[PDB]
A paper describes a structure:
The Lon protease is a AAA+ protein found in prokaryotes, archaea, and eukaryotic organelles. Lon is known to form a homohexamer; each protomer is composed of multiple domains, including an N-terminal substrate-binding globular domain (NGD), a long-helix domain (LH), a three-helix bundle (3H), a AAA+ ATPase module, and a protease domain. We show here, using cryo-electron microscopy (cryo-EM), that the activation process of the Lon AAA+ protease may involve a pentameric assembly and a substrate-dependent incorporation of the sixth protomer to form the substrate-pore-loop contacts seen in the translocating state.
Unexpectedly, both MtaLon-Y224S:ATPγS and wild-type MtaLon, whether with ADP or lacking nucleotide, predominantly formed left-handed spiral pentamers or spiral hexamers, rather than closed-ring hexamers. Surprisingly, the pentameric form consistently emerged as the most prevalent class. The pentameric assembly forms a left-handed open-spiral structure. The open-spiral pentamer forms a large gap between the protomers Ob1 and Ob5. The pentamer forms a tensegrity helix triangle (THT), consisting of three overlapping LHs from Ob1, Ob3, and Ob5, forming an interlocked, letter A-shaped structure that tethers together five protomers.
Numbering used by the authors:
A (entry chain E): 249 to 496
B (entry chain D): 497 to 774
C (entry chain E): 596 to 645
D (entry chain E): 695 to 744
E (entry chain C): 547 to 645
F (entry chain D), G (entry chain C): 249 to 298
The structure:
């Protein structure tokens, strides 16, 4: 785990916080809670590869082909997506910055939301994930649980990063309408923060200390209730109405 | 003022959002079309979203095929980008209605048109207060009734209707949202149209206050009633005679659509909103 | 008896109306946790009928 | 007697007028699962037929 | 007096017309709004309907023109203003005198 | 932080209370709140602008 | 703190508990309100007029 930090490519901030949690090690690793939680943060960070990306597609035509093969486009929901991606080929100032929401999805319970997200990840040529949101008790499957002692739970987002190797996945956010927390304060705050385009680059958790740069990554969200959501989740949340299915 | 907010600061914000600088251009009745058609708000939130969606459809329609860098969008083809009119383009079109008194009021998130409807049955002589009324609209209605009972030769009514017509009155927001029962000549128009069985004119909103001698007494906050008529698409407003005084402090942008027919005796608001008056 | 269409965000569902026009006096009876707006539209219903 | 296999959604007024409705296509999602072949609508939501 | 005072600071610090200034009558509606309450209520062409009581109010007295609408009809007594009975007592008493 | 209590320009009693935060620590940095409570409180009153 | 008690002319029904919070001393303020509430309640006792 000392070799691990220069075994795995990093950004500077991930490198530096990895060096930090390396430094709090090298004692008893069976008790002594600074050491064990440093080992967990060193594993959950350094086993995330970096300095590499998925193919980011710059082709809606590829995208219109790929998405129209799992269910068959459904005449309205496809072209709203194609609008959002149409400004993705027309990013302002030639940097891919969002300045925009992330297409939160609501519909009836049973329509192909999973098919939508994974199909996107094919069409965007990216690596799909989905982490724990729908019905969480505390910001430990959503956000971080605070460290310097173990008992701190890692990020499932950091699990998706330790599972991916690259710097642009498609992070599904499922059933955010029932996102709860035992932590005083909404994780909806960390939602509305991270979705503005330059707030993920400096973003941390209670589990993250130095800015774990989530910068280059498009996010996506699903839920299934038309009325109830936090009020900060109606900015930077683009609600797209999904219909049920009829007999043909 | 909304259009000038658009061309000066708003619309360049949107065509800097979607990267289309030096690509799309926009006319007079383009912005005025988005204004009188696709929002009835009380600020400029909805206009910035609708100009956002024009920007995104401009991104796609330039995107998959990129021929022009000088895209003029005029007031004939905006449904390509946005679709159906969500509202009337014109509220000069709404066809004299029976029980409809166009109210003016201030729902405190934005100006309204609190259309009271009142239905006149055959029956026993009794007032019903639907729409969750307090006493306030009942007693202003009672005042309008007593005025009208003072004047039944005009409105074609037989002289003793009050014993034989039960009244059913519908009020959306059935308490005063401004905290003011200022819908006096509203309910006078509604009830005189409802009992006269004759359609109350569209396109002329009115607001006021009545009392039992037949008096259109003055109201409070004249500017906000005039702005609610200016947002929600009405043009002629009917105001009391005792507000010549509040009227001339108004910044002269506000006054430049409106055509006021000042009243003080309720026979004069009721000679304007009814075409078949008895 | 009349069938009621609705959306419900649980997935789609339906309703039926059941009306017992009992011998009475005009005094409206509502059952099934019938909301106030159904009460007002009932007023409008019977009023339109009058 | 009423009719069969004909369902409906609509807002009435105290004058008795069909004030139009929101979420039309959604109502047809929840309703045209129930197979009711002739559904009656307000005149103004031809705007969401198209 | 506050609104006079602050607009005095306005009309000053646009550029001082003087070193010492004066305001007399009818140099007020420059400094204030429209004059809200008209002068003495004597000016007002005596009304066919209604006279005007003095009255208590628990935050100190005022006037109350008590309008009465003799509406040709049945023979009754309503009372708007959502009165108690006590006005129906006094109305019936005064009506008895007149009878 | 003991560098910054100087560097963070503060009023006198605030500097005093900050050194008292310094003195109630220097024994807890693994800690359940006994580290983190005085650590985040030192970090707040360093990063409030005086 | 002791002189402030003995330059106000207090009842001895005060100065009894005055010397009581003079007895309660030699504890923490940085770890707990233990001499905070002691010294501040005692200064309330001083700075009210007798």
């Amino acid at each position: 785990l000392r070799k691990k930090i220069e075994e795995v490519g990093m950004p500077e901030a991930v490198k530096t916080k990895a060096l930090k949690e390396l430094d709090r090690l090298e004692r008893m690793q069976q008790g002594s809670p600074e050491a064990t939680v440093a080992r967990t943060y060193l594993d959950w960070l350094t086993e995330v590869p970096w300095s590499k990306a998925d193919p980011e597609v710059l082709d809606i035509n590829h995208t219109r082909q790929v998405l129209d093969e799992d269910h068959y486009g459904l005449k309205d929901v496809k072209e709203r997506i194609l609008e959002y991606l149409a400004v993705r080929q027309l990013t302002q100032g030639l940097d891919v910055r969002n300045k925009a929401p992330i297409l939160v999805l609501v519909g009836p319970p049973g329509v192909g939301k999973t098919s939508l997200g994974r199909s996107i990840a094919r069409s965007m040529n990216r690596k799909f994930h989905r982490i724990s949101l729908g019905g969480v008790r505390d910001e430990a499957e959503i956000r971080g649980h605070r460290r310097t002692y173990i008992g701190a739970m890692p990020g499932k987002l950091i699990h998706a990063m330790k599972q991916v190797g690259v710097i642009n996945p498609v992070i599904l956010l499922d059933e955010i309408d029932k996102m709860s927390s035992d932590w005083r304060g909404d994780p909806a705050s960390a939602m509305l923060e991270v979705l503005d385009p330059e707030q993920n680059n400096t973003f941390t958790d209670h589990y993250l200390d130095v800015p774990y740069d989530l910068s280059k990554v498009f996010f996506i969200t699903t839920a299934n209730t038309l009325q109830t959501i936090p009020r900060p989740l109606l900015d930077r949340m683009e609600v797209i109405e999904i219909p049920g299915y009829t007999n043909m | 003022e909304k259009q000038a907010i658009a061309r000066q600061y708003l619309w360049p914000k949107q065509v800097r959002e979607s990267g289309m600088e030096g690509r799309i251009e926009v006319t007079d009745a383009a912005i005025l079309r988005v204004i009188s058609e696709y929002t009835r708000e009380a600020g400029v939130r909805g206009l910035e979203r609708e100009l956002g969606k024009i920007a995104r459809k401009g991104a796609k329609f330039w995107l998959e095929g990129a021929w022009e860098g000088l895209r003029t969008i005029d007031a004939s083809d905006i449904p390509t980008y946005l679709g159906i009119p969500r509202y009337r383009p014109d509220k000069a079109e709404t066809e004299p209605q029976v029980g409809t008194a166009q109210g003016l009021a201030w729902t405190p998130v934005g100006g309204t048109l609190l259309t009271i409807e009142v239905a006149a049955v055959p029956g026993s002589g009794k007032l019903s207060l639907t729409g969750q009324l307090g006493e306030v609209m009942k007693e202003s209605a009672q005042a309008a009734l007593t005025y009208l009972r003072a004047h039944t030769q005009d409105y074609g009514l037989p002289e003793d209707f009050y014993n034989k017509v039960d009244l059913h009155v519908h009020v959306p927001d059935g308490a005063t949202p401004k905290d003011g029962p200022s819908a006096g000549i509203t309910m006078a128009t509604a009830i005189a149209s409802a009992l006269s069985r004759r359609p109350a004119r569209m396109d002329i909103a009115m607001t006021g206050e009545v009392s039992l001698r037949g008096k259109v007494m003055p109201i409070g906050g004249v500017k906000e009633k005039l702005l609610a008529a200016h947002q929600a698409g009405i043009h002629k407003i009917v105001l009391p005679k005792d507000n010549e005084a509040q009227l001339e402090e108004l910044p002269k942008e506000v006054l430049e659509g409106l055509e006021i027919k000042l009243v003080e005796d309720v026979g004069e608001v009721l000679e304007y909103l009814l075409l078949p008056e008895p």
